[PDB]
Ligand binder design. Structure first.
Ligand SMILES: Nc1ncnc2c1ncn2[C@@H]1O[C@@H]2CO[P@@](=O)(S)O[C@@H]3[C@H](O)[C@@H](CO[P@@](=O)(S)O[C@H]2[C@H]1F)O[C@H]3n1cnc2c(=O)[nH]ncc21
Lengths: 181, 181
């Protein structure tokens, strides 16, 4: 089933990352200058995408790890698309606590197509087994990695974070990539 | 490339139609009772999805056919998803003119994965030809049709409109399905 993950990675790029990444620097700059608290640390540049290879995608990040608390939303981005006038592309800012203290703030979210791959393995009509789900999660990340390496929209404004759980601290995995800048 | 369209149809259902169709009747009922003009006709029930098999998906419907003018938006639906707090699912209401007069109003939009399939055929890194795009557009509609026929969320609240252009009047194609209720 090579084509499911390949097709989903191309979709995630065309209908989402190629549309929001060119205008993401302006949205973060706008937040830091007019909506961000003058005393707190600046929101880091780049969209951080969590890619769990087990496809365990919760709807709220505070459940996945306690040290990732929701801070605020970025200014909404709108655009007419496929007949929907002013479709909204919203992104959330999170705090990454270390020793009970704000160590970094960034725009963070899961790659939604991995939640879709998990759900596909649960429906019988889909005809997709859970053994095929692990390789499809890897294929999705490799395809997206290849697309972004040669993409003009990807210009130091996106970071992929792949990981596999066997104590795995998700906040430390994000802080490792965030401090590498 | 059977798996690209199959994977995109399952995605369109899991990450979109299974989430918005159970609460679509309430959104239309709310519009008709509090936001709709008391003198104009009621907004019809069901989400009408345009499925052009040529994958020609414009961002605005008034370009595709002049007799489809934008009326207003439905009340926005929000939900926390894949780490995005209050992600917005917005839908647009359109008027269908016949002989220069409002013949019907409905929630109408294109299936966005078909715009993605068109774009995939244009990128060389995707490895997807334009001959394979026509069969993939058909495979997507068949798979979505099969999913919705046995879906509990699909309970008289969704209508698929597939068509192929060779004068094709899109407004008449929508009014034909709308009057069949
Ligand atoms: N605003 C946003 N916030 C966060 N992530 C966003 C995003 N937009 C896009 N993405 C990301 O890119 C993928 C391709 O997005 P598309 O719109 S091209 O089509 C998708 C896909 O076919 C399927 C699965 O959904 P999922 O979220 S897993 O996949 C998304 C997601 F991973 O449902 C469609 N679908 C989903 N929502 C809507 C909607 O509102 N209208 N019409 C259609 C629609």
């Amino acid at each position: 089933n090579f084509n499911v993950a390949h097709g989903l990675a191309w979709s995630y790029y065309i209908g989402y990352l190629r549309l929001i990444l060119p205008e993401l620097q302006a949205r973060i700059r706008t937040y830091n200058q007019h909506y961000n608290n003058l005393l707190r640390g600046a929101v880091s540049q780049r969209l951080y995408i969590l890619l769990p290879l087990d496809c365990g995608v919760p709807d709220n990040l505070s459940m996945a790890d306690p040290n990732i608390r929701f801070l605020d939303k970025l200014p909404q981005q709108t655009g007419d698309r496929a007949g929907i006038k002013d479709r909204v592309y919203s992104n959330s800012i999170y705090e990454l606590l270390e020793n009970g203290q704000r160590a970094g703030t960034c725009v963070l979210e899961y790659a939604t197509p991995l939640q879709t791959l998990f759900a596909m393995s649960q429906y019988s009509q889909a005809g997709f087994s859970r053994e095929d789900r692990l390789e499809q999660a890897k294929l999705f990340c490799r395809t997206l990695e290849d697309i972004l390496a040669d993409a003009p929209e990807s210009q130091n404004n996106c970071r992929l974070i792949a990981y596999q759980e066997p104590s795995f601290s998700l906040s430390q995995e994000v802080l490792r990539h965030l401090r590498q800048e």
